[PDB]
């Protein structure tokens, strides 16, 4: 009855709250942030420990050995360090984010030690694996095969808080999501691989998502959907598509930022602090002076008179005299400013929407078109929908390892019925409900 | 510490739950429905009493005399009967629905008896009066006058349950809302009274409501918005508009039902039960036979090939072989069928959206454009947003009369700060939050 929660804040809160319900468990918390762990310590009964994972690797080995399970809530590049500690000692692990290629190399060492390491847990990845494999196993139970798998997911504000230029509010730093617009998107469609161009042209791949008539959604494909054939075992499927959901207008606003030259990792531009008007004067290539003059330069650069994108930049204060935050690049400076202007206030709900669609060919010959809807809202005096959907699957999988319900050993995701069955059942009690519907087509 | 709740089911549940928190209060319940009061008695500790209000008026007088307050949750035509009982005895009253002209005649008798009767309590009417008068009093505190008052309100499904032809699910019978499409809409706009034609042409008055970009809303005006000048004391205002909110496509689907001849109070049409295909054959004027034949007759009648309206009727089963419910008219038969096909399941959320907009002229000369947003969702293992917004204002006003906080006497709405101030404060704790924002225009 003892666990180490590496990392703190936001994702940790529901993990600590869920584990501390029974009482018979000692929560230890390791963290780099000094102020955050102190604030987290006030809410939940824990043992505060301050440590860097890379620098203080010696004390990690001794601390990890004292526990029954390590819950890593750190960035996914640092999992080889925590896995290196966990394989040496006799101790299990659970991971929120992806299982990287670096962590996949340890699978030989992990199985030899006789321990269980569960990765790919949370919303996405996580619940996407669980809902997919539930349906895929149900199809295999009756001899049926998967012909198509389309799955869209999105974390976004509740409709009442969608009235801004991006129709969005940021939970954490947008450096990743902004850079994903520059990245490509590969997916399979009707036995043909479709590569989509990132950057300026990525707006052309955006489509209207009309599965909820009342909800004004757009969609676009993720970075790589072809990998799910090997993961789920559905290489016979002619269509594999995975995408992200936003409200309509989001990608067009980011397309504005791409035109202006804001989405890049170049450094910032003598004896006076750099304001946003002065930075945009640099990009459009004029002297730092006159606000009505840069308006003419910016609107000219943002296509043939795109007033919507001009107003989006005006609303956020990109043409104003506010100071540019100190940062390593222009993209990092933009990200800090967007976090400042578009964040969730204390009484503002977020939303998690997730929509799957399966084409299932039965042995009879007919095609079942199965759909899954998962929609959750944040609680006012409680956890956000993002925190619950990311936190609870990792927290529940952790409790299942301590109780001794998961008998399997080695490195793995939540793909087996042993893992996904109990989790999907238990998240219903926490207010994460998913419905199902299917129709037959002869 | 004793009250009589006339009427039961849906609206009563949150009223009984709110009043029974402290414990020091005896809940009595009068009702016409025998099965409903028994089911309600299982959940909350009450005294079941079965009675018709009109027929058994003798026992009402004796039962009402035993109580401290009568909470009427009946149809609004029956309030003169309950008011006639309450004025005779020394006892207060609270009312959910409108204060009718018939109830307004008793105001002389009500004041002479030395009692308090609060009407117009709930969502709409109710919270519309409270939010309006809060802003209007705040304007009068700084010498400012109201130039415009626009206020849209709507009870509808949460976006995830909007995928049907009406984008709607009915909480109670739709005979009222369907008949309101046939009724006119009067309102004031820029010092000019605007009368809108009901029926077939009412679709032309429907407008896009874009205050939440993520929410795909339509709006249309209510039956009479000119009366709020006298009620709020804003006769100087050049614009008075009150409307109802739905998801886009709702009024166009009802417009389909108007074209087909379904929205009317004519009676139903020998030795075999009447099906929906046979009823639509009567209306389009063909023999009761062949489903593909009536499809051609119906689509011809529903404008020049309106396939959307044809599919809406097809989806609901209006061209199928299901039996028409027993009813006094075609509209009543349609209403029973729509309740059957489009209702809330146990785990399905509803939504209350409400949006006000004030043009406030200050003594300085400038114009304040103030806006109010109120959005609430139904709880999964709890009350619906409709039940909370309708029930709690009546329940809170009832508690304030028993505690002796409302000192005023006579017949009234919730217009004074004495009533609306404490209620708006207390509904925040129950999960009904409203935000405010304003901008100055020189
Ligand atoms: O960015 S999201 O909308 N969804 C993340 C998923 C997985 C990667 C791309 N789409 C978030 F809000 F959930 F983070
Ligand atoms: O019908 S609604 O959408 N709103 C009622 C208000 C008051 C009368 C017309 N509009 C309801 F769902 F709340 F009942």
From Swiss-Prot, chains A, B:
Positions where N6-acetyllysine occurs in the chain: 43, 55, 104, 227, 259, 277, 296
Positions bound to L-saccharopine: 97-98, 124, 223, 244-246
Region (Saccharopine dehydrogenase): 1-442
Domain of life of the source: Eukaryota
Modified-residue entries (N6-succinyllysine), positions: 43, 55, 104, 252, 277
Upregulation: Induced by starvation.
Sites where the protein binds NAD(+): 8, 32, 36, 53, 74, 96-97, 123-125
Expressed in which tissues: Expressed in all 16 tissues examined with highest expression in the liver.
Subcellular location: Mitochondrion
Subunit structure: Homotetramer.
Function: Bifunctional enzyme that catalyzes the first two steps in lysine degradation.
Domain notes: The N-terminal and the C-terminal domains contain respectively the lysine ketoglutarate reductase and saccharopine dehydrogenase activity.
Entry's disease: Hyperlysinemia, 1: An autosomal recessive metabolic condition with variable clinical features. Some patients present with non-specific seizures, hypotonia, or mildly delayed psychomotor development, and increased serum lysine and pipecolic acid on laboratory analysis. However, about half of the probands are reported to be asymptomatic, and hyperlysinemia is generally considered to be a benign metabolic variant.
Protein family according to the UniProt entry: In the N-terminal section; belongs to the AlaDH/PNT family. In the C-terminal section; belongs to the saccharopine dehydrogenase family.
Name of the protein in its database record: Alpha-aminoadipic semialdehyde synthase, mitochondrial
Lineage summary: Eukaryota, Metazoa, Chordata, Craniata, Vertebrata
Gene coding for it: AASS
Residues of the full protein shown: 481 to 926 of 926
């Amino acid at each position: 009855r003892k666990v180490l929660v590496l990392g703190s804040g936001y994702i940790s809160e529901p993990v600590l709250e869920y584990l501390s319900r029974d009482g018979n468990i000692e929560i230890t918390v390791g963290s780099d942030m000094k102020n955050q762990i102190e604030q987290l310590g006030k809410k939940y009964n824990i043992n505060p420990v301050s440590m860097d994972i890379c620098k203080q690797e010696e004390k990690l080995g001794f601390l990890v050995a004292k526990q029954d399970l390590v819950i890593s809530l750190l960035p996914y590049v640092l999992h080889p360090l925590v896995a290196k500690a966990c394989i040496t000692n006799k101790v299990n692990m659970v991971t929120a984010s992806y299982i990287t290629p670096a962590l996949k190399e340890l699978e030989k060492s992990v199985e030899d030690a006789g321990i269980t390491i569960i990765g790919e847990l949370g919303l996405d990845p996580g619940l996407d694996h669980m809902l997919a494999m539930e349906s895929i196993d149900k199809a295999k139970e009756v001899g049926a095969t998967i012909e198509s798998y389309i799955s869209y997911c999105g974390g976004l504000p509740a409709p009442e808080h969608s009235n801004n230029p991006l129709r969005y509010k940021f939970s954490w730093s947008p450096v990743g999501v902004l850079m994903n617009v520059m990245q490509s998107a590969t997916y399979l469609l009707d036995g043909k691989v479709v590569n989509v161009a990132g950057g300026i042209s990525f707006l052309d791949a955006v489509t209207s998502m009309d599965f909820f008539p009342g909800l004004n959604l757009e969609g676009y494909p993720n970075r790589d959907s072809t990998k799910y054939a090997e993961i789920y075992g559905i290489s016979s499927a002619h269509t594999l598509l995975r995408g992200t959901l936003r409200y309509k207008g989001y990608m067009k606003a980011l397309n504005g930022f791409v035109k202006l030259g804001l989405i890049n990792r170049e450094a910032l531009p003598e004896a006076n602090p750099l304001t946003w008007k002065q930075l945009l004067c640099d990009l459009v290539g004029i002297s730092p002076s006159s606000e009505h003059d840069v308006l003419k330069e910016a609107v000219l650069k943002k296509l043939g008179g795109d007033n919507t994108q001009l107003e989006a930049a005006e609303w956020l204060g990109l043409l104003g005299d506010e100071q540019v935050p100190q940062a390593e690049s222009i993209l990092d400076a933009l990200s800090k400013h967007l976090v400042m202007k578009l964040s969730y206030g204390p009484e503002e709900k977020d939303m998690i929407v997730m929509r799957d669609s399966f084409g299932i060919r039965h042995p009879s010959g007919h095609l079942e078109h199965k759909t899954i809807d998962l929609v959750a809202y944040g609680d006012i005096n409680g956890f956000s929908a993002m925190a619950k959907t990311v936190g609870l699957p990792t927290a529940m999988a952790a409790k299942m390892l301590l109780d001794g319900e998961i008998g399997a050993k080695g490195l793995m995701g939540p793909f087996s019925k042993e893992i996904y069955g109990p989790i999907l059942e238990r998240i219903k009690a926490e207010g994460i409900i998913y419905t199902t519907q299917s129709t037959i087509k002869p």
